[model samples]
Target chain A: DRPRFSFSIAAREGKARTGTIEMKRGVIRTPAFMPVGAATVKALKPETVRATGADIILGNTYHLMLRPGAERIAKLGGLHSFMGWDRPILTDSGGYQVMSLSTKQSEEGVTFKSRHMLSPERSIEIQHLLGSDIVMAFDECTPYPATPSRAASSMERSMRWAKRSRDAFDSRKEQAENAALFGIQQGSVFENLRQQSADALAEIGFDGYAVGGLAVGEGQDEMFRVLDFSVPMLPDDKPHYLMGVGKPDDIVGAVERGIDMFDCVLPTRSGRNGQAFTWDGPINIRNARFSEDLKPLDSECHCAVCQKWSRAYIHHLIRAGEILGAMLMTEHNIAFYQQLMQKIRDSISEGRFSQFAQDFRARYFA
Target chain B: DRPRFSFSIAAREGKARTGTIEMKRGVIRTPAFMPVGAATVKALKPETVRATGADIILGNTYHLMLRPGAERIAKLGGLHSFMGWDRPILTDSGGYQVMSLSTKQSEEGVTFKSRHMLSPERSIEIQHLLGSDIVMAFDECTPYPATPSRAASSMERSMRWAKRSRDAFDSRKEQAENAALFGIQQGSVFENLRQQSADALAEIGFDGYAVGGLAVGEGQDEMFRVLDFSVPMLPDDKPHYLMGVGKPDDIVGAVERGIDMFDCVLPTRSGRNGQAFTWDGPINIRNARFSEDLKPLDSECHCAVCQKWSRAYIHHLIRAGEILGAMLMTEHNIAFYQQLMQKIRDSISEGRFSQFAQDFRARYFA
Candidate 1:
């Protein structure tokens, strides 16, 4: 008999473990680096992303559910058929809105004041209809620099909503068994509060657990500390996802500290801004230094942009403000990140994550 | 010895003929249906477009020179490297701007206030810098319902500029030899003026000739009538390009009257508007009738969009105004047009173009 979905620890070294998530959609090689395409990954076509050996992609519930409307997506055979991508799609709950639309928005599910001037009064129903394989329960993504009291109050509200989210998902469970609901642990810093939120979520018993309330501006050292203290508390049998964990270095640090799934807009957003992620460091394509540098964004990248174009050519395109610049650079960056994840998974499987992480950081950060 | 970018009459049947324009770029399959891809072919992607068997793509010199700036393009290794397309590119000489950018534009040259904020006087130098494989000489694309005198005046002024264009191109012939320049005959519906423009251009000499000043709200019968007299007046050895001539049916009519090359934004633009070119006339994808129809855009199309996606899905995409919807439909539309051209060419080569034309109209307008 086939199981709905399953994950097992194939190997382990300290906190670092490697395995696979088997489902009807596809086998996601772990610890997998899902490229944050948002709704649609910008530069490289979706197939190009898959060709980079990525098994899963992360979509933004906030973005898609807002614009296309989730009910429409379900009617259009879900997002897989709509966007021409058939792979498993994991979508974030509207948690990031607690930071972005902070003014008119609140924890009782996000309220978007329509960009195209439609009626307001929007709510959490947006994320529900996006037809995501993994739906995030809506929570107030607590902002950075809140007093301990302020943080706890927000965390409590989020927990209350988490219970409602689980209930909402439970009602629809019969229709979609393959769809998993992830519980977000949101308490900004302050270790005891973090523990309380985790315990509360554990009682709720989600299919997956996410370490949120960080990456809002927590910086590296503080972020690592939170993950070190928090990740160990989440159920080990279920996948532990870090909401918005990013940059090449940041991902390595989080993965080393035992985080499983990750998503970020940096690879694409940075690519659009002419900043590219490479193994050595982030290379700025618009810099005068790259004006005549006839090298690929990363010599190690096998993407079409790197394979055929020169840095000199890309530099001119960037300076000229060509969309192709964004397209090519983003393709390279996504491929680089996707490749990074593949190599990390390989190293963990072979019991060499420590060596890989160390050597990677040494050269990457040097 | 190669004759430096010359056209040879390989075969012929009445006004319609088959030939090859031999240049360093590549041999263009005559009566060629060039996919209108502006600065870059949208979602067809260059590789996919080539796979669909396109010999060349139409670039709007007006758009490319304006957006990316032509000098910037040449320095970045010309349009080929900039767009990552290696095949031939036929660029309009910005003549169609007479209609597209109608306001504040006159017989002298179209004065754009600049979609960009840059403050420079716009002129012929911009088109020259685009470095297209086939360059169109500047001309006023006369509007429909124009007087004979207006057409004569525009043609005469265009002829003078054509000589200036010839001198400028000849001065840069060393690098420009790789590119072919086509002179445009813009006489509106005036036959004498058309002959006058053609004879003047013959004395000045050009790599090819184009029948402009049509496809601007003129009925198909009037356009074909202009082609009937105007096309035979132009040199037979040179390629005859039809500027902005369109509609699947319009293309067949132009071809029957001896027109060779064509560039139109209709197929792609109409595709974005939910209109699809099919054997049984055009179908509107946004029609509620197609909401649940699980068929391709055109069952006859071999394009990826038609082969992989259903009409219901595409209809949903278009109604939702998805960019992928425009991208997919545009690719399919372009491929359909190209396939039509192949069938037309095959018919002519086998000496059955009349039968092919009649059959094409029957099914296409069905």
Candidate 2:
């Protein structure tokens, strides 16, 4: 029998693992950091993003559905063709409300103020229309820093929604046969709730599992602590996706705790904000010090932007509000993330993630 | 002895010709359209720009000198290194004031009331510092819509400045040896004035002659009328550059009237504004009708944007104001210009430029 998708673990160092996620579209090397875009990474071409050694990139369902609309994407040959990215595209179900859009959230689903009814069924339907390779299950984002009862209510509702998402995803036989659905675990830093959420999702039986509702209001320390207990509770054989886990170090920490896939807006967002992630800590490229500094933006890395342009030039462009600056900065930032992932994967393959993490942290914080 | 810069005419059909301009940097095909940027095509990478078959790109003396400053560019290993363009870069002499700036014009120089002096000597010096391959000699832009006396004074003053520019350019023995200096003809729309300007430039002698001060104010018909007499007056051996020329038809018209080179902001600017140039005339891609158009932006053309993405997708991106949209638009637009030039070159080489021009005009205006 043919498989929908396969995630094979190549090597394991502690809980950290090096592997690959194979779907019909392509093989995504893990532990991977997927850069999110509005279908395409802002300021970068789809092919350019691929050339930076990315296996898969993420598309936001809420944004795309609202703007270009899901039906529009379907008609334009699906999201993959429309975005010019042939590689596997993982789309999030329109679960996380983009920070309060004057919306109404009910047991049925979220009714977006202007135009969208983002129920679990509709979310699954949209991803199917988008031709997503890996579709995230619809789940409520458990509010950070909430009361125990509030967290419990949110987590419980999410579990119910996960069931609905599973049924909705399963209802479409053709889409479900080809696409992988990832169920979300939303416990809001609570170990017991995480266990319940995980058990519920495991009972529903998704292709993969995602740790959501962290990195929202919680600090890295708390997030890592949450992942330590939360990750082990999920189906260990399946891919564990840490949704929106961030900062270069946080990713390494998350990987060390047995996460296989990761996605974030940090690299792309930071790049546009004139913030660049280099090996020796993130530097603001718009500062006065780089005005005549004839050095590469990241001296150690040799991505196209770093290999070709001087820091001074990128600085000039950014300060002058040049579009090329954003393009170069975003490119280099994405590369930096991809490069980190590769190093993590290599270290895990060598059975030395512990050593790799220590060394990377020291260098990154330098 | 090897020639400094060679302009060889390969084929001529009527007044239209196809040829190449060979400098140390590279060979630039004639009837070329140079897209301007702040040392870049706004949002595009230099390599991407080069991939469009552009043999040469232009730099502004004023923009570079004022922003990053010429010395800064020189220290950063010249404009080529700073901008990541190794191809021949033709920089204009900062002669035409960007606008009125409460300036004092003298036999010596124009004293801008602000941070800098814009003398002919300094203009040549700025371009030299920036390592421009084809440097224009400093000349005042004859005010358009001027009385005959006003036009004559401006033309004579520009000629005087041209001599000063010539002397200053020649004074730098090392810079002179490596770079080619072009003289700009600055007569207002008068035939005798143009002849005098051309004769004065001929006596001075230059690697190239530019028909300036025409596109500034004169109508296309009048500009072509000016070029009829103006282009014939220049030395037949040197390149005839038509500065700041325009639309697709305008470029073809200029070529038909014996012009060899052109630069414009139309293609790049129009692309950013959601306007696209196609074989069947320019269309505003942002139109409501294109929202669901499954066809390519230009069905007749096969640029990367056309080959892969549909018009519906590009329209979506532009309406959403996605940065990728701007990048794709500019790249495609530049390719369109390059494609136009190639078609023109091919038609001339095959001795059917008359037919080609007619065909192109009909299709372009369709």
TM-score of chain A of each: 0.92, 0.98
- B197-294 in candidate 2: lDDT tens per residue? 99999999899999989777778888988888889999988889998898899999999999989998888888989999888899999999998898
Candidate 2 residues lying further than 4 Å off, grouped into runs, are A99-102, B100-102
Clash count, candidate 1: 1
Q: Candidate 2: DockQ?
A: 0.80
**Best-fitting candidate, measured by lDDT?**
2
Model 2 residue B173 CA deviation (Å) reads 1.3
- Stretch of 10 with least lDDT, candidate 1 chain A: A115-124
Fnat for the candidates in order: 0.04, 0.82
lDDT of each: 0.75, 0.87
